[PDB]
Design brief:
The complex is a heterodimer of chains A (223) and B (35). Chain A is mainly beta. Chain A has helices at residues 145-151, 213-222; strands at residues 5-6, 15-19, 23-31, 34-37, 47-50, 63-72, 86-90, 115-120, 136-141, 160-163, 180-183, 186-194, 204-208. In chain A, strand 11 and strand 12 (186-194) form a beta hairpin. Chain B has one domain (1-27). In chain B, strands 1-2-3 form a three-stranded antiparallel sheet, with no helix packed on it. Strand 12 (186-194) of chain A pairs antiparallel with strand 3 of chain B, so a sheet runs across the interface. Bound molecules: calcium ion (CA). Calcium ion binds at residues 52, 54-55, 57-59, 62 of chain A.
């Protein structure tokens, strides 16, 4: 997260880290045994880390649980990043508490101009690299479809939206992929891609979760 | 243009695509530590 702030320990209790020997993506706990992340974050053998603040110190809020299933949307296309969503089933249910809690799925898609909370352990610089120890947060609004399409000609599908600031300075960034965009108390987005980070006229692009509520419920039910 | 439209590259472990604007766009994952 570039231009963000320290969230505060366990203030984003649905934020998870996906670990493949190191932190590589975020995700969002949506019930005690399922996480939503980005399809491009797929790896076999993922360990999900819940309750994290300082991603490099064992502090005592943590639960580490292996994925038992990591399910990329079948229509994910790595060439276009369309349908950039994955469901991870935890091998055993997380114990839910004030520090480890699920986030609700949307009941409707978000509107342009709604403020959202974006979070992660990614890079905090737009030039060069600096990775934070603690979880970072960013308040950022949903941008109009037309401004998103104008910024990324020919690349924005109906399954994507932009959020952030056209003036630049505030964005998600490398290491944030898969993590949450929460608006109106609901999981509306998944950190996916962008041109650089925090550049002018290049806002972050996010998977549009509201298009997948039925898919999510059906995939959970059958797995 | 920093790239020719339609090209691809990696930056570290992230995949990138060159848009029709001649600008790279990349995914936002973390990557293995360097040697
Ligand atoms: Ca920790």
């Amino acid at each position: 997260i570039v231009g963000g702030y320290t969230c505060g320990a366990n203030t984003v209790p649905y934020q998870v880290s996906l670990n493949s020997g190191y932190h590589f993506c975020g995700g969002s706990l949506i019930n005690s045994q399922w996480v939503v992340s980005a399809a491009h974050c797929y790896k076999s053998g993922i360990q999900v880390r819940l309750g994290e603040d300082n991603i490099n110190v064992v502090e005592g809020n943590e639960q580490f649980i292996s994925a038992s299933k990591s399910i990329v949307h079948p229509s994910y296309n790595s060439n276009t990043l369309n349908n950039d969503i994955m469901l991870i089933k935890l091998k055993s249910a997380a114990s839910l508490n004030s520090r480890v809690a699920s986030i609700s799925l949307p009941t409707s898609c978000a509107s342009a101009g709604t403020q959202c909370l974006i979070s992660g352990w990614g890079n905090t610089k737009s030039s060069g690299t600096s990775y934070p120890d603690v979880l970072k947060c960013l308040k950022a609004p949903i941008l109009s479809d037309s401004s998103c399409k104008s910024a990324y000609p020919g690349q924005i599908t109906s399954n994507m939206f932009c959020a952030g600031y056209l003036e630049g300075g505030k964005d998600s960034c490398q290491g944030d992929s898969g993590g949450p965009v929460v608006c109106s108390g609901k999981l509306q987005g998944i950190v996916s891609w962008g041109s650089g980070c925090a550049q002018k006229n290049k806002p972050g692009v996010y998977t549009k979760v509201c298009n997948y509520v039925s898919w999510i419920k059906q995939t959970i039910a059958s797995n | 243009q920093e790239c020719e439209p339609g090209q691809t590259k990696k930056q570290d472990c992230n995949t990138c695509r060159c848009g029709s604007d001649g600008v790279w766009a990349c995914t936002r994952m973390g990557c293995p530590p360097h040697a």
